[PDB]
């Protein structure tokens, strides 16, 4: 869970993200796949070249799920249980990969909303994305 | 290593970096985002709040030094280990810093470059800077023993 | 939390560990500090050279704590409460270091009890030490 | 890299390893300790329980091939990247293995050597073997793209 000053920065930054959700998703994944190409091993049949329709479509879903976490921020694990089964049991994504994606979303947010991306906002988002990542990750791995 | 495109790109953007500000901004963020790192700079004073940290004159002056060390590495990509040997012994022998922390500072610096350059800090430019900050972290952890 | 059969393996091996607790703790730490020297950064004022009496002494305390978890294997987080507060709130030990120690303890057990260290016992121990590591680490870090 | 002491110690002990079994023991333990790794070997048959894995002939045969690759690495410690390029491309392009997994097999191999050598697998001997497996892991992840 997060604190008041944190939950409110999350909710408040989300308002800004929502109107550019599609491009934030796409950019987050392009940064990820180009900076840490080994993460592509989890998408063997996807075309993950920059600009691809498939990468773009996936980026929209990822940011939309972050939205689900923000909506049910008081109970993220509850809201993401199906996605959690998908990422833990089904796909067995190694925990390290979530850190790589989270960092790329922070990079994207910092470049997109420089004024709202204070050290304090950066801290609340790093913490929020760590909660999201733990939820999606196979416990104890 | 870094390709002509990557090397030229990171060098060109580095020329536009405010050297009295970026370093302190990166060190400040590290202390705020990863609170535990405050323990290594207790002589710095009040770091009890995000504003305290970001306004701290000491956070900023030391940040300038860290920024300077990064500039040196950027000038010595092909010999980062030789370039950071002394700082590495210093961080291991005197400061006792878990080198896993170097990665955090690198990530935070990457966020600061994105924060300042916005659209110009594209995904391929970030991928180039990720190689540099990983290379510097590696070199700084190299003389640990 | 562990399976019933897994807990059985942990309990049975702990009986063998207990009579050699001191050298198991010591060997575990010598393996850790020599294989992963960076972990020594957390012990600035310790003499961590092989054979050090200070290293031997810390090792006995590590193995004793593992012992407490085994005793309360059905409520590990509860039993290690204070130790958890120490490594999280006060020491702020990065999570990667627990994996390094866990691996060195496994190596120690594999060399000391070869007949009991089957693939099944190896898996039970890897899982038990992952629960112990998670209980001892700052959540989400 | 590896000092004269470390390189001679890993070379000496490796000469005592049963090449028809150690690799199969390490692959089997990987599949049992880290069950998700079974997804990559579905064609191997029954890997449903610890006994099924440790008695599976395909596990033992592929493990002999993995052990063979480590022996090659041990014979070319100064050029692991070139030595593992082809395998690196295979694990990336055809097998889609997250390289984070290579560290797990390396660690299980170290446990198997400890298991077989007992007292002889001293802490300094292990430290030398860790450099080798980290090196092999890094080389095998080098051609990913
Ligand atoms: C903040 C963390 C992340 C979120 C919020 C997230 C969200 C999503 C969503 C929404 C789906 C679509 C599921 C569906 O439509 O049924 C999904 C699928 C997937 N995600 Fe994640 N994910 C995250 C991290 C990761 C990471 C770090 C990796 C691995 C690098 C990953 C690998 C996958 C894969 C392989 C799929 C399935 C794609 C397919 O074959 O259809 N995810 N994810
Ligand atoms: C990875 C990038 C890093 C670089 C390039 C860097 C660079 C430097 C340099 C050049 C000095 C100052 C030397 C002088 O004054 O002449 C130094 C000192 C110091 N660094 Fe680092 N450092 C890094 C990471 C870290 C991290 C992450 C920590 C701790 C969490 C840290 C803690 C310290 C401390 C405590 C000092 C002494 C500060 C003082 O009391 O004056 N450094 N570093
Ligand atoms: C299974 C994992 C571990 C267990 C069970 C464990 C257990 C213990 C215990 C019982 C103590 C003594 C506390 C006391 O005297 O009250 C201790 C102290 C400490 N531990 Fe751990 N520990 C583990 C992992 C780690 C790791 C991975 C690190 C860092 C590399 C570490 C760093 C420390 C430090 C620095 C101290 C305080 C030492 C001192 O100043 O006396 N521990 N640990
Ligand atoms: C880090 C150590 C590793 C080494 C040195 C290694 C070595 C090899 C070698 C020599 C081959 C055999 C090719 C042949 O028979 O000609 C191979 C194939 C293969 N490897 Fe790896 N490997 C490593 C780790 C991994 C990991 C961790 C996984 C999976 C989690 C994996 C999955 C595969 C698969 C699925 C095959 C194809 C097997 C088959 O269907 O025949 N490898 N590996």
XYZ file of C-alpha atoms and ligand atoms in Angstrom:
744
model
C 0.000 0.000 0.000
C 0.924 3.692 -0.482
C 0.466 6.792 1.739
C -1.913 9.784 1.246
C 0.568 12.157 -0.325
C 1.523 9.179 -2.589
C -1.933 7.885 -3.570
C -2.885 11.427 -4.499
C 0.158 11.979 -6.734
C -0.635 8.690 -8.409
C -4.306 9.630 -8.928
C -3.326 13.117 -10.072
C -0.611 11.956 -12.529
C -3.001 9.339 -13.857
C -5.435 12.124 -14.926
C -2.627 13.451 -17.152
C -1.557 10.043 -18.400
C -5.066 9.035 -19.403
C -5.334 11.482 -22.270
C -2.085 10.218 -23.810
C -2.350 6.637 -22.634
C -1.766 5.066 -26.043
C 1.489 6.869 -26.807
C 2.767 6.506 -23.215
C 2.217 2.748 -23.525
C 3.884 2.543 -26.925
C 6.848 4.659 -25.841
C 7.285 2.701 -22.582
C 7.541 -0.587 -24.542
C 9.820 0.849 -27.280
C 12.202 2.085 -24.548
C 12.023 -1.307 -22.885
C 12.569 -3.472 -25.911
C 15.332 -1.326 -27.346
C 17.156 -0.765 -23.982
C 16.763 -4.357 -22.704
C 16.270 -6.533 -25.814
C 16.314 -9.753 -23.754
C 12.869 -8.874 -22.483
C 11.642 -9.748 -25.983
C 12.120 -13.408 -25.240
C 8.739 -13.350 -23.593
C 6.992 -12.348 -26.893
C 8.321 -14.931 -29.401
C 5.617 -14.384 -31.978
C 5.208 -10.618 -31.650
C 6.680 -8.101 -34.000
C 8.398 -5.849 -31.470
C 10.147 -3.513 -33.868
C 9.507 0.182 -33.116
C 6.329 1.427 -34.702
C 4.795 -1.996 -35.097
C 0.984 -2.220 -34.697
C 1.386 -5.160 -32.393
C 3.759 -3.371 -30.001
C 1.469 -0.333 -29.999
C -1.616 -2.429 -29.238
C 0.233 -4.136 -26.400
C 1.367 -0.814 -24.988
C -2.293 0.327 -24.779
C -3.237 -2.704 -22.770
C -0.342 -2.307 -20.377
C -1.203 1.284 -19.635
C -4.873 0.453 -19.375
C -4.026 -2.191 -16.656
C -1.936 0.391 -14.781
C -5.263 2.336 -14.859
C -7.064 -0.584 -13.283
C -4.439 -0.522 -10.492
C -4.976 3.219 -10.002
C -8.798 2.781 -9.882
C -8.449 0.003 -7.251
C -5.385 1.469 -5.621
C -6.654 0.500 -2.164
C -6.627 -3.076 -3.262
C -4.355 -3.648 -6.215
C -3.847 -7.329 -5.598
C -7.570 -7.819 -5.764
C -8.048 -5.910 -8.993
C -5.151 -7.616 -10.784
C -5.683 -11.282 -9.746
C -6.343 -12.522 -13.266
C -3.311 -10.606 -14.624
C -1.310 -11.939 -11.774
C -2.196 -15.515 -12.678
C -1.168 -14.681 -16.204
C 2.243 -13.201 -15.276
C 3.125 -15.616 -12.472
C 1.774 -19.078 -13.161
C 1.143 -18.912 -16.877
C 4.002 -16.867 -18.308
C 6.396 -17.129 -15.349
C 7.983 -13.765 -16.033
C 11.233 -13.347 -14.099
C 10.933 -10.577 -11.490
C 13.911 -8.663 -12.967
C 11.906 -7.841 -16.049
C 9.297 -5.857 -14.042
C 11.977 -3.546 -12.772
C 13.139 -2.936 -16.374
C 9.560 -2.055 -17.499
C 8.862 0.135 -14.476
C 12.069 2.126 -15.072
C 11.067 2.648 -18.686
C 7.598 3.912 -17.703
C 9.238 6.340 -15.211
C 11.557 7.544 -18.016
C 8.541 8.046 -20.248
C 6.645 9.989 -17.520
C 9.674 12.174 -16.769
C 9.995 13.178 -20.416
C 6.188 13.667 -20.839
C 5.258 15.548 -17.649
C 8.385 17.320 -16.502
C 6.558 19.737 -14.180
C 4.511 17.118 -12.403
C 7.558 14.708 -12.253
C 9.106 16.069 -9.032
C 11.447 13.935 -6.886
C 8.409 13.263 -4.715
C 6.234 12.152 -7.706
C 9.111 10.016 -9.012
C 9.232 8.355 -5.544
C 5.524 7.681 -5.332
C 5.448 6.221 -8.900
C 8.557 4.102 -8.333
C 6.824 2.779 -5.178
C 3.400 2.273 -6.902
C 4.959 0.363 -9.837
C 6.927 -1.786 -7.317
C 3.600 -2.703 -5.686
C 2.108 -3.467 -9.076
C 5.139 -5.577 -10.002
C 4.994 -7.596 -6.774
C 1.393 -8.319 -7.343
C 2.013 -9.615 -10.842
C 5.074 -11.640 -9.849
C 5.201 -15.249 -8.715
C 5.565 -14.953 -4.949
C 9.064 -15.565 -3.545
C 10.675 -16.062 -6.966
C 30.475 -1.240 -27.028
C 28.762 1.957 -28.432
C 28.116 2.413 -32.171
C 29.009 5.519 -34.163
C 25.347 6.507 -33.950
C 25.121 5.814 -30.187
C 28.502 7.400 -29.329
C 27.770 10.510 -31.375
C 24.274 10.754 -29.962
C 25.233 10.511 -26.283
C 28.175 12.907 -26.848
C 26.020 15.532 -28.598
C 23.339 15.528 -25.930
C 25.948 15.550 -23.160
C 27.242 18.865 -24.555
C 23.810 20.387 -23.708
C 23.722 19.285 -20.074
C 23.761 21.937 -17.342
C 26.774 20.690 -15.327
C 25.888 22.613 -12.092
C 22.358 21.215 -11.965
C 21.874 17.690 -13.444
C 24.224 15.999 -10.994
C 22.491 17.477 -7.979
C 19.128 16.694 -9.427
C 20.133 13.058 -9.872
C 21.636 12.771 -6.359
C 18.588 14.457 -4.891
C 16.192 12.070 -6.602
C 18.273 9.063 -5.479
C 17.919 10.225 -1.809
C 14.218 10.804 -2.170
C 13.279 7.785 -4.232
C 15.606 5.364 -2.371
C 15.491 6.783 1.263
C 17.958 4.248 2.505
C 20.749 5.917 0.530
C 20.459 8.880 2.927
C 22.440 6.871 5.461
C 25.643 7.490 3.425
C 25.380 11.271 3.581
C 24.493 12.126 7.157
C 26.872 15.090 7.146
C 24.591 16.613 4.590
C 21.995 17.686 7.142
C 18.215 17.857 6.609
C 16.950 15.295 4.077
C 13.753 14.711 5.987
C 11.490 15.847 3.173
C 11.583 15.971 -0.650
C 11.876 19.775 -0.500
C 14.565 19.596 2.088
C 16.548 17.219 -0.082
C 16.088 19.094 -3.326
C 16.977 22.416 -1.653
C 20.001 21.051 0.211
C 23.207 22.897 -0.864
C 25.287 19.906 -0.044
C 23.160 17.467 -2.149
C 23.772 19.880 -5.071
C 27.555 20.372 -4.675
C 28.296 16.698 -4.275
C 25.944 16.016 -7.209
C 28.187 18.243 -9.330
C 31.150 16.040 -8.494
C 29.273 12.841 -9.409
C 28.247 14.505 -12.649
C 31.896 15.296 -13.287
C 32.899 11.660 -12.802
C 30.269 10.622 -15.334
C 31.654 13.193 -17.815
C 35.073 11.592 -17.396
C 33.718 8.150 -18.202
C 31.914 9.480 -21.288
C 35.282 10.747 -22.391
C 36.803 7.301 -21.709
C 34.239 4.720 -22.826
C 36.904 2.264 -23.928
C 38.623 2.313 -20.521
C 35.999 2.787 -17.862
C 37.684 0.351 -15.452
C 40.994 2.203 -15.492
C 39.106 5.454 -15.296
C 37.122 4.443 -12.188
C 39.669 2.283 -10.327
C 40.355 4.848 -7.634
C 36.737 5.825 -7.053
C 35.942 2.068 -6.929
C 38.486 1.465 -4.107
C 37.129 4.554 -2.432
C 33.571 3.323 -2.587
C 34.524 -0.144 -1.410
C 37.284 0.603 1.151
C 36.140 3.894 2.640
C 32.428 4.364 1.949
C 31.371 0.707 2.065
C 28.662 1.242 -0.559
C 26.863 -1.936 -1.847
C 27.606 -1.583 -5.605
C 24.012 -2.623 -6.319
C 23.296 1.006 -5.419
C 25.328 2.271 -8.433
C 22.602 0.916 -10.722
C 20.017 2.981 -8.902
C 22.004 6.200 -9.377
C 22.465 5.350 -13.093
C 18.696 4.804 -13.505
C 17.933 8.059 -11.736
C 20.411 9.946 -13.903
C 18.660 8.452 -16.954
C 15.335 9.810 -15.629
C 16.887 13.282 -15.144
C 18.187 13.359 -18.745
C 14.671 12.388 -19.898
C 13.186 15.048 -17.657
C 15.378 17.756 -19.183
C 15.459 16.702 -22.797
C 11.887 15.453 -23.178
C 11.049 14.359 -26.759
C 14.726 14.576 -27.677
C 15.611 11.744 -25.272
C 14.158 9.172 -27.621
C 14.129 5.424 -27.015
C 17.325 4.823 -29.063
C 19.103 7.678 -27.265
C 17.989 6.163 -23.940
C 19.330 2.733 -25.029
C 22.733 4.374 -25.649
C 22.730 6.091 -22.234
C 21.695 2.809 -20.540
C 24.936 1.218 -21.905
C 26.984 4.108 -20.501
C 25.427 4.133 -17.068
C 25.748 0.273 -16.835
C 29.322 0.520 -18.009
C 30.113 3.128 -15.328
C 28.342 1.083 -12.589
C 30.345 -1.955 -13.616
C 33.621 -0.106 -13.533
C 32.819 1.466 -10.174
C 32.124 -2.031 -8.705
C 35.245 -3.451 -10.273
C 37.875 -3.011 -7.599
C 35.651 -4.275 -4.855
C 37.388 -6.971 -2.845
C 4.342 -21.081 3.580
C 5.597 -24.542 2.563
C 4.051 -27.856 1.552
C 3.752 -30.574 4.236
C 6.277 -32.844 2.542
C 8.612 -29.873 2.057
C 8.352 -28.907 5.719
C 9.185 -32.499 6.568
C 12.448 -32.270 4.621
C 13.385 -28.941 6.214
C 12.707 -30.304 9.729
C 14.645 -33.545 9.154
C 17.712 -31.826 7.694
C 17.656 -29.204 10.460
C 18.167 -32.030 12.961
C 21.452 -32.865 11.149
C 22.395 -29.190 10.792
C 21.974 -28.550 14.498
C 24.930 -30.617 15.693
C 27.237 -28.839 13.197
C 25.534 -25.502 13.384
C 28.725 -23.619 14.147
C 30.762 -24.860 11.246
C 27.779 -24.688 8.900
C 27.298 -20.994 9.757
C 30.983 -20.265 9.419
C 31.382 -22.106 6.145
C 28.318 -20.378 4.746
C 29.769 -16.995 5.469
C 33.229 -17.808 4.196
C 31.658 -18.938 0.911
C 29.564 -15.793 0.702
C 32.308 -13.280 1.502
C 34.841 -14.934 -0.765
C 32.438 -15.556 -3.691
C 30.561 -12.274 -3.431
C 33.064 -9.820 -1.783
C 30.692 -6.913 -2.187
C 28.500 -8.315 0.489
C 31.251 -7.331 2.968
C 30.196 -3.709 2.591
C 27.473 -4.181 5.099
C 30.018 -5.180 7.824
C 32.355 -2.205 7.845
C 33.812 -2.865 11.295
C 33.985 -6.648 11.081
C 37.078 -8.569 10.366
C 35.663 -10.834 7.583
C 38.848 -12.604 6.492
C 38.679 -16.447 6.483
C 39.158 -17.946 9.941
C 38.207 -14.682 11.616
C 36.607 -15.363 15.028
C 34.171 -12.506 14.285
C 33.064 -14.190 11.038
C 32.650 -17.510 12.910
C 30.595 -15.786 15.601
C 28.240 -14.098 13.125
C 27.738 -17.393 11.308
C 26.456 -19.083 14.493
C 23.935 -16.308 14.867
C 22.783 -16.783 11.251
C 22.311 -20.482 11.641
C 20.501 -19.931 14.981
C 17.972 -17.652 13.213
C 17.423 -20.219 10.483
C 16.760 -22.590 13.420
C 14.021 -20.290 14.790
C 12.302 -20.266 11.394
C 12.392 -24.025 11.319
C 10.919 -24.181 14.869
C 8.066 -21.903 13.664
C 8.089 -23.119 10.093
C 4.323 -22.620 9.947
C 4.610 -18.992 10.933
C 7.952 -17.809 9.632
C 7.181 -14.087 9.362
C 5.911 -14.103 12.909
C 8.972 -15.806 14.345
C 11.472 -13.571 12.522
C 9.618 -10.294 13.291
C 12.482 -8.463 15.037
C 15.068 -9.767 12.625
C 12.891 -8.559 9.781
C 12.732 -5.072 11.313
C 16.498 -5.146 11.708
C 17.430 -6.068 8.129
C 14.729 -3.861 6.597
C 14.250 -0.667 8.731
C 17.780 -0.515 10.148
C 20.326 -2.307 8.002
C 18.578 -1.638 4.685
C 20.249 -4.666 3.012
C 19.593 -4.815 -0.735
C 17.445 -7.910 -1.677
C 19.993 -9.387 -4.022
C 22.347 -10.127 -1.125
C 19.843 -12.584 0.459
C 19.849 -14.682 -2.688
C 23.660 -14.794 -2.506
C 23.664 -15.974 1.124
C 20.872 -18.553 0.396
C 22.898 -20.006 -2.507
C 26.008 -20.273 -0.243
C 24.001 -22.054 2.492
C 22.657 -24.462 -0.141
C 26.192 -25.124 -1.393
C 27.213 -25.745 2.205
C 24.416 -28.261 2.768
C 25.033 -30.009 -0.555
C 28.677 -30.630 0.398
C 27.938 -31.586 4.050
C 24.901 -33.887 3.689
C 25.138 -35.329 0.175
C 22.761 -38.284 0.752
C 20.010 -36.064 2.095
C 20.509 -33.263 -0.428
C 18.375 -34.787 -3.185
C 16.832 -32.641 -5.932
C 13.673 -32.709 -3.877
C 15.397 -31.526 -0.643
C 17.313 -28.895 -2.717
C 14.010 -27.596 -3.963
C 12.494 -27.608 -0.412
C 15.504 -25.693 0.966
C 15.596 -23.211 -1.937
C 11.899 -22.447 -1.278
C 12.284 -22.244 2.535
C 15.209 -19.834 2.273
C 13.233 -17.750 -0.331
C 10.375 -17.411 2.265
C 12.951 -16.524 4.939
C 14.581 -14.010 2.553
C 11.228 -12.423 1.723
C 10.271 -12.133 5.359
C 13.599 -10.430 6.059
C 13.514 -7.905 3.197
C 11.942 -4.424 2.959
C 8.713 -5.022 1.076
C 8.751 -3.973 -2.610
C 12.418 -2.912 -2.589
C 39.684 -12.872 -14.877
C 40.975 -16.019 -13.105
C 44.296 -16.035 -11.252
C 46.809 -18.760 -11.733
C 45.504 -20.352 -8.523
C 41.832 -20.159 -9.538
C 42.272 -21.296 -13.121
C 44.403 -24.248 -12.053
C 41.920 -25.163 -9.330
C 38.886 -25.211 -11.630
C 40.903 -27.051 -14.304
C 42.159 -29.659 -11.824
C 38.778 -30.480 -10.267
C 37.014 -30.486 -13.609
C 39.352 -33.294 -14.706
C 37.695 -35.374 -11.953
C 34.062 -34.775 -12.960
C 32.016 -37.694 -14.361
C 31.078 -36.216 -17.745
C 28.220 -38.615 -18.348
C 26.391 -37.646 -15.163
C 27.177 -34.190 -13.719
C 25.478 -32.284 -16.527
C 22.362 -34.479 -16.211
C 22.393 -33.960 -12.459
C 22.561 -30.179 -12.875
C 19.821 -30.030 -15.585
C 17.626 -32.280 -13.514
C 17.975 -30.129 -10.415
C 17.232 -27.007 -12.498
C 13.942 -28.594 -13.656
C 13.020 -29.623 -10.146
C 14.129 -26.585 -8.190
C 12.902 -24.038 -10.797
C 9.785 -25.833 -12.300
C 8.964 -23.124 -14.804
C 12.119 -24.227 -16.644
C 10.261 -27.442 -17.543
C 8.210 -25.460 -20.107
C 11.270 -25.357 -22.325
C 11.739 -29.141 -22.381
C 8.208 -30.503 -23.024
C 9.505 -32.982 -25.616
C 11.582 -34.681 -22.864
C 8.614 -36.531 -21.520
C 7.724 -37.123 -17.913
C 9.175 -34.368 -15.638
C 6.148 -34.572 -13.299
C 7.978 -35.433 -10.039
C 11.552 -35.296 -8.650
C 12.072 -38.984 -9.336
C 10.726 -38.733 -12.844
C 13.144 -35.917 -13.683
C 16.198 -37.438 -12.120
C 15.645 -40.744 -13.927
C 14.654 -39.253 -17.290
C 17.017 -40.360 -20.041
C 16.531 -37.254 -22.169
C 17.382 -35.052 -19.182
C 20.616 -37.013 -18.683
C 21.530 -36.862 -22.427
C 20.857 -33.129 -22.847
C 22.696 -32.455 -19.589
C 25.763 -34.191 -21.067
C 25.585 -31.708 -23.953
C 25.276 -28.757 -21.548
C 28.258 -30.076 -19.588
C 30.161 -30.329 -22.842
C 29.554 -26.614 -23.475
C 30.857 -25.701 -19.961
C 33.987 -27.791 -20.626
C 34.486 -25.805 -23.807
C 34.106 -22.621 -21.836
C 36.628 -23.869 -19.294
C 39.035 -24.534 -22.110
C 38.593 -21.024 -23.492
C 38.257 -18.796 -20.431
C 39.858 -15.906 -22.251
C 37.293 -15.910 -25.071
C 33.911 -16.985 -23.783
C 31.978 -14.591 -26.038
C 33.369 -16.003 -29.235
C 33.064 -19.500 -27.833
C 29.324 -19.120 -26.993
C 28.183 -16.844 -29.886
C 26.442 -19.596 -31.776
C 24.749 -20.991 -28.644
C 23.858 -17.452 -27.611
C 22.089 -16.874 -30.910
C 20.346 -20.235 -30.535
C 19.065 -19.505 -27.006
C 17.869 -16.022 -28.137
C 16.489 -16.576 -31.673
C 15.166 -20.166 -31.533
C 14.693 -21.007 -27.896
C 13.540 -17.625 -26.493
C 15.172 -18.168 -23.113
C 15.225 -15.201 -20.739
C 19.012 -15.030 -19.965
C 18.135 -14.434 -16.265
C 17.695 -18.222 -16.277
C 21.389 -18.923 -17.138
C 22.406 -17.789 -13.669
C 20.089 -20.413 -12.195
C 21.668 -23.263 -14.094
C 25.108 -21.943 -13.138
C 24.136 -21.969 -9.487
C 22.678 -25.414 -9.664
C 25.908 -26.656 -11.380
C 27.919 -25.185 -8.458
C 25.609 -27.045 -6.042
C 26.214 -30.273 -7.942
C 30.014 -29.890 -7.785
C 29.734 -29.214 -4.017
C 27.508 -32.231 -3.749
C 30.071 -34.489 -5.522
C 33.318 -33.012 -4.122
C 32.237 -32.390 -0.539
C 35.140 -31.051 1.591
C 37.285 -30.616 -1.499
C 34.863 -27.984 -2.849
C 36.305 -25.335 -0.558
C 35.097 -21.742 -0.408
C 38.021 -20.496 -2.579
C 37.389 -23.301 -5.090
C 33.683 -22.222 -5.247
C 34.598 -18.548 -5.684
C 36.696 -19.594 -8.662
C 33.801 -21.706 -10.060
C 31.384 -18.735 -9.560
C 33.570 -16.584 -11.819
C 33.381 -19.328 -14.437
C 29.637 -19.750 -14.371
C 28.952 -15.993 -14.276
C 31.322 -15.775 -17.253
C 29.516 -18.525 -19.171
C 26.118 -16.927 -18.342
C 27.323 -13.532 -19.583
C 28.730 -14.985 -22.787
C 25.574 -16.945 -23.467
C 23.508 -13.746 -23.061
C 25.878 -11.656 -25.281
C 24.307 -12.166 -28.712
C 20.724 -11.490 -27.588
C 19.113 -8.686 -29.643
C 3.582 -2.991 -14.803
C 3.681 -4.398 -15.286
C 2.987 -4.935 -16.387
C 1.622 -4.794 -16.655
C 0.740 -3.778 -15.919
C 1.316 -5.755 -17.610
C 0.099 -5.877 -18.257
C -0.245 -6.777 -19.335
C -1.623 -6.889 -19.940
C -2.732 -5.957 -19.861
C -1.617 -7.989 -20.632
C -2.686 -8.377 -21.641
C -3.361 -9.573 -21.015
C -4.636 -9.958 -21.773
O -5.037 -9.149 -22.646
O -5.220 -11.043 -21.485
C -0.267 -8.617 -20.531
C 0.129 -9.647 -21.235
C 1.502 -9.999 -21.282
N 2.536 -9.431 -20.530
Fe 2.485 -8.056 -19.173
N 2.414 -6.564 -17.941
C 3.428 -6.082 -17.197
C 4.763 -6.605 -17.183
C 5.250 -7.516 -18.031
C 6.670 -7.842 -18.113
C 7.776 -7.156 -17.249
C 6.785 -8.746 -19.052
C 7.836 -9.474 -19.549
C 8.935 -8.684 -20.087
C 5.334 -9.051 -19.529
C 4.995 -10.060 -20.437
C 3.685 -10.216 -20.902
C 3.343 -11.188 -21.890
C 4.271 -12.201 -22.522
C 1.989 -11.057 -22.081
C 1.194 -11.940 -23.007
C 1.228 -11.430 -24.428
C 0.518 -12.393 -25.383
O 1.145 -13.401 -25.819
O -0.661 -12.146 -25.677
N 4.496 -8.243 -18.893
N 0.516 -7.811 -19.755
C 27.453 5.110 -9.770
C 27.869 6.449 -9.829
C 28.654 7.006 -8.777
C 29.568 7.897 -9.047
C 30.059 8.173 -10.462
C 30.026 8.473 -7.791
C 31.086 9.391 -7.725
C 31.715 9.849 -6.562
C 32.812 10.779 -6.456
C 33.612 11.398 -7.613
C 32.978 11.062 -5.121
C 33.476 12.338 -4.504
C 34.978 12.288 -4.574
C 35.622 13.637 -4.231
O 35.025 14.422 -3.457
O 36.733 13.896 -4.745
C 32.124 10.184 -4.408
C 31.951 10.181 -3.002
C 30.920 9.597 -2.318
N 30.012 8.739 -2.846
Fe 29.870 8.151 -4.808
N 29.457 7.849 -6.745
C 28.581 6.967 -7.290
C 27.672 6.204 -6.527
C 27.465 6.349 -5.149
C 26.341 5.787 -4.421
C 25.109 5.172 -5.035
C 26.573 6.091 -3.110
C 25.890 5.742 -1.984
C 24.576 5.182 -1.930
C 27.714 6.955 -3.084
C 28.239 7.445 -1.919
C 29.278 8.287 -1.812
C 29.685 8.893 -0.579
C 29.115 8.644 0.831
C 30.695 9.719 -0.936
C 31.512 10.637 0.007
C 30.660 11.869 0.121
C 31.187 12.826 1.169
O 30.973 12.577 2.379
O 31.824 13.817 0.783
N 28.236 7.122 -4.320
N 31.314 9.467 -5.318
C 18.803 -16.044 5.771
C 19.291 -14.707 5.824
C 19.865 -14.128 6.957
C 19.637 -14.404 8.269
C 18.783 -15.500 8.900
C 20.303 -13.360 9.018
C 20.358 -13.338 10.381
C 21.019 -12.406 11.165
C 21.009 -12.422 12.645
C 20.301 -13.363 13.658
C 21.810 -11.323 12.933
C 22.241 -10.890 14.323
C 21.224 -9.913 14.868
C 21.466 -9.662 16.338
O 22.625 -9.890 16.771
O 20.505 -9.240 17.034
C 22.204 -10.626 11.736
C 22.812 -9.404 11.714
C 23.113 -8.703 10.551
N 22.832 -9.122 9.253
Fe 21.858 -10.728 8.711
N 20.924 -12.419 8.187
C 20.652 -12.890 6.892
C 21.031 -12.216 5.699
C 21.797 -11.049 5.683
C 22.293 -10.457 4.436
C 21.951 -11.070 3.079
C 23.108 -9.391 4.786
C 23.842 -8.511 4.028
C 24.818 -8.959 3.174
C 23.071 -9.370 6.296
C 23.478 -8.253 7.033
C 23.399 -8.180 8.411
C 24.146 -7.192 9.216
C 25.014 -6.086 8.642
C 23.934 -7.507 10.523
C 24.388 -6.700 11.716
C 25.808 -7.078 11.973
C 26.429 -6.331 13.178
O 26.708 -5.117 13.037
O 26.649 -6.976 14.239
N 22.292 -10.367 6.792
N 21.718 -11.313 10.649
C 23.792 -21.292 -18.979
C 24.051 -22.579 -19.423
C 23.584 -23.128 -20.612
C 24.406 -23.783 -21.359
C 25.959 -23.774 -21.213
C 23.461 -24.408 -22.375
C 23.841 -25.224 -23.380
C 23.015 -25.719 -24.416
C 23.537 -26.621 -25.505
C 25.019 -27.209 -25.706
C 22.444 -26.951 -26.225
C 22.332 -28.251 -27.010
C 22.368 -28.199 -28.448
C 22.690 -29.566 -29.069
O 22.228 -30.639 -28.582
O 23.420 -29.541 -30.068
C 21.323 -26.251 -25.684
C 19.975 -26.451 -26.184
C 18.826 -26.011 -25.429
N 18.870 -25.156 -24.296
Fe 20.473 -24.502 -23.283
N 22.143 -23.993 -22.202
C 22.170 -23.213 -21.145
C 21.000 -22.807 -20.451
C 19.669 -22.990 -20.821
C 18.522 -22.579 -20.012
C 18.644 -21.938 -18.590
C 17.419 -23.131 -20.619
C 16.047 -23.083 -20.309
C 15.468 -22.499 -19.159
C 17.921 -23.768 -21.847
C 17.101 -24.278 -22.840
C 17.578 -24.950 -23.970
C 16.684 -25.737 -24.794
C 15.128 -25.821 -24.687
C 17.459 -26.388 -25.657
C 16.895 -27.238 -26.788
C 16.852 -28.655 -26.216
C 16.235 -29.624 -27.217
O 15.027 -29.511 -27.484
O 16.949 -30.463 -27.756
N 19.279 -23.712 -21.930
N 21.686 -25.570 -24.519
